[model samples]
Target: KVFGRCELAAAMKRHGLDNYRGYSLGNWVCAAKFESNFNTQATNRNTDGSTDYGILQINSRWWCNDGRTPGSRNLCNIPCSALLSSDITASVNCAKKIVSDGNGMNAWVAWRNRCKGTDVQAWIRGCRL
Candidate 1:
């Protein structure tokens, strides 16, 4: 089960995304649609959830040491309560760190390219964070 729209919007806000005008949430959502149909509780038995997974469709085992259990506190290190307490922004911030370690929003940009349109490579040519 993916988070509701309002929950997602709130997470974006907590991460300092004052506006969703050009952020990666749209791209993230688009990617999730293709990857897991935007289902946060989704799991693939084939890979034991090792493949593309979760709300952001993150490969948790590869990105972080978090296990593959839904609502796992170790997933993002930050407690679920903390994330729930804030908004999508906070969750997104945590996700960003897991993917890029603060360099750039490469994951978002990549997701946008892969899922947003047909011309993925072309679309990602000049993408910014």
Candidate 2:
């Protein structure tokens, strides 16, 4: 379920993402680009035995329940599938909570390696929002 950048940005903004947990709509868009390219069904399995969930690539171990692992912290208290919906209200809220507990976008390793010092405006370049 991949969406256009404009659609994603507009949703993020309207969903109250302006400055949630020190992350701007710009940061969310950039991270989504590198992490999952705005694909709501994206899931990346890590070597650490955890999976990255939709939109934000949130880890299974920390945020959501994967059901395969016992004792998952599931700090977000939702199933991992919750983040895989095109309606990302749950993902947005969970992402904010995760960042607050950690170090801003740095908690998202892809954010640090790719979006961190990059010109994030390119992410929303043609969005017209």
Candidate 3:
């Protein structure tokens, strides 16, 4: 599913992403925009032979298992397919794990280059919190 800006914001907030690992809600939203543009079905095949799945683009190499990613750790212990669901529950759960794993938001390069240290509040401007 392709979420509207406010809808994605509301969902992320509901999932406790706000102030997660010292990152604001908008920071997560901004990272999601750059990662998948809020599309649940988004997938990216990496040159390293892994794939990124869902809005947060969880990597198959270290997070979810795709059955074919070389040396996949499947740290989340979930099928990569789960991340494609529009519900986003699994995605959020795995994202929490990703952040808590000490990577913080730096787990995603998109977050590093775009959301990190930026005026992420613009991502949620006018959205009802």
Candidate 4:
């Protein structure tokens, strides 16, 4: 369940993004470093057996119509399980569109507001376009 750099790169390409602004491959590594600790298979618990799945920590039950079973794909047509697939960047892109229609950086900023201690930019590095 370990993801290598090539897999991460492929995921980014699948999403039609060449590079994250400010966040290089290394910066991405940092984001993932803080977000999920590089654990693509990670899942978080919710009441009634529902859960957030994959590296991006997305909750499939809320987004995807599919039941919250392990490895269930296609969350509300967003493919939540895809986030854990070898193509993680694409999976994250899918999440981005769901939240902001390709405005992943915006979503990142919002997330950073809650997750980061200082400022969103400090944690994201080069997330702005």
lDDT of each: 0.46, 0.86, 0.93, 0.52
Give the alpha carbon lDDT tens digit for every residue of 1-129 in model 2: 897888999988888886687666788899988889989999999887889999889998889999875556899989999999989998988987888885888998889998887888777777767
Give the per-residue lDDT digits (tens) of candidate 3, residues 16-83: 88888888999989989999999999999999999999999999989998999977799898999999
Scored against the true structure, residue 124 in model 3 reaches a CA lDDT of 93
Lowest-scoring 10 consecutive residues by lDDT in candidate 3?
15-24
Ranking by TM-score: 3, 2, 4, 1
| Cα-based RMSD of candidate 1 | 7.7
In model 2, the runs with Cα more than 4 Å from the true position are none
lDDT for position 12 in model 4: 47
| Angstrom error at residue 16, model 4 | 3.2
Candidate 3 stretches with Cα past 4 Å from truth are none
Quality of model 1 by C-alpha lDDT: 0.46
Which candidate leads the pack in lDDT?
Answer: 3
The list of candidate 4 runs beyond 4 A from truth reads 4-14, 17-29, 47-49, 68-79, 99-129
Q: What TM-score should be assigned to candidate 4?
A: 0.52
lDDT of 1 by residue, 8-53 (tens): 4344445654323344455544444555554565444324544443
Native-to-model Cα distance after best TM-score fit, residue 112 in candidate 1, in Å: 5.4
